[PDB]
Amino acid sequence: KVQTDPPSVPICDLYPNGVFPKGQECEYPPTQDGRTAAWRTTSEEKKALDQASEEIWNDFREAAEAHRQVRKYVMSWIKPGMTMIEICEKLEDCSRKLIKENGLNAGLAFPTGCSLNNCAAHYTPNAGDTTVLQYDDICKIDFGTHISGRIIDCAFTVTFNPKYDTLLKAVKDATNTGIKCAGIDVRLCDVGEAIQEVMESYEVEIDGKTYQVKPIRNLNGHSIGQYRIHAGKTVPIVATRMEEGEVYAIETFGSTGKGVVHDDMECSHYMKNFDVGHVPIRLPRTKHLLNVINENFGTLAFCRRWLDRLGESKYLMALKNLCDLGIVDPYPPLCDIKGSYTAQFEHTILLRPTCKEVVSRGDDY
């Protein structure tokens, strides 16, 4: 079976034997002492431990192939004049088809981020949002796919005006640096220090103003767990080591602003607190909403548009109740100062026993 244009064929139909394309495979970086970690590639113990988790890497690979094909399609049509809603719906319709959405077993890991300009992350339009993409907008497309809760967290920046080219270059180089420095037994702060050094080596000129690119210090790379976008370990920009078999989202953000984000605009993104157990609720609308969340999302993130498409209405008070009880956490848009520009690149990497796999790498980024 061959993929259509626009893509509509599920990835699992393109690979019937259930064996999906590998991402970029990298030898681990050498230690401080200069001795290589190349021994991992040829170790019989490492090869066996790697093959024991083959089904897991395979689920990430299926989700990464859906991500590559969705984003290549997005790049062919994303244009100024389109509303943010139109962009998110057209992207998500394709994502659901390629991932072969099946309740909590395959689907969308989190809402389509399409944060603009000074806003770096966690903006997706809510119903009635009339925002239109502009020629001068710097748009961060951040979307997620999953197979059995094996999440692909992967993002890029969309622009139409060449004035942002050097800012995009700086961030892409910083993300790629973070990915290269990542490895088993590597200290998380060393990855962060490598990212910062590369990011700040760039100076950019935008509309007659110059800036030294700043990494956003409170938007960090993180570990990923099953059905858990952020598994608790962070790659800090400003003791903890990466371990064998861990999975990371290596993401970096460059800014012309303060290099710090704050909560701004209305909230669209929400997610159940992973650690909260069963909570009995009698309030009817609140109980119904939590059941809708448990059935459709579990511990994966969602947005208000995703409740609307399920035929839910008059749920805002119910959603506020779940947030106030600590069952659900709101994730509002995170923005730098007015007039600033932010850019992002992100990949998911597998710290396999034998090698480091940039599972979401494409020919694009």
Q: Which residues bind Mn ion (CB under 5 A)?
A: 142, 153, 155, 249, 251, 346
Strands (E), 246-361: 247-255, 262-263, 269-272, 302-303, 328-331, 334-335, 342-351, 356-358
Q: Considering the rule CB under 6 A, would residue 272 count as an interface residue with ligand HZE?
A: no
Q: Considering the rule CB under 6 A, would residue 146 count as an interface residue with ligand HZE?
A: no
The Cβ of residue 279 has, within 10 Å, a number of other Cβ atoms equal to 11
Active site residue 288: no
Active site residue 197: no
Q: Which residue is nearest to Mn ion (CB)?
A: 249
Q: Which does 281 bind (CB under 5 to 8 A by kind): Mn ion, ligand HZE, none?
A: none
Nearest to 74, CA basis, from 136, 131, 145, 20 = 145
Q: Which is nearer to ligand HZE, 2 or 239 (CB)?
A: 239
Angstrom distance (rounded) from CA 8 to CA 13:
10
Question: Residue 181 burial (CB < 10 Å; 0-12/13-18/19+)?
Answer: buried
Q: Is 230 assigned to a binding site?
A: yes
Chain positions 252 to 271 lying near ligand HZE, rule: CB under 6 A, are 269-271
- Which of 28, 110, 227, 248 touches ligand HZE (CB under 6 A)? 110
Q: Which is nearer to Mn ion, 191 or 292 (CB)?
A: 191
Q: Containing H/E element for 141?
A: strand 139-147
- Which of 111, 125, 225, 259 touches ligand HZE (CB under 6 A)? 111
Q: Which is nearer to ligand HZE, 50 or 251 (CB)?
A: 251
Assigned token pair, 154:
């992967």
Active site residue 207: no
Q: Is 185 assigned to a binding site?
A: no
Active site residue 205: no
Q: Which stretch binds ligand HZE (CB under 6 A): 20-28, 41-49, 222-230, 313-321?
A: 222-230
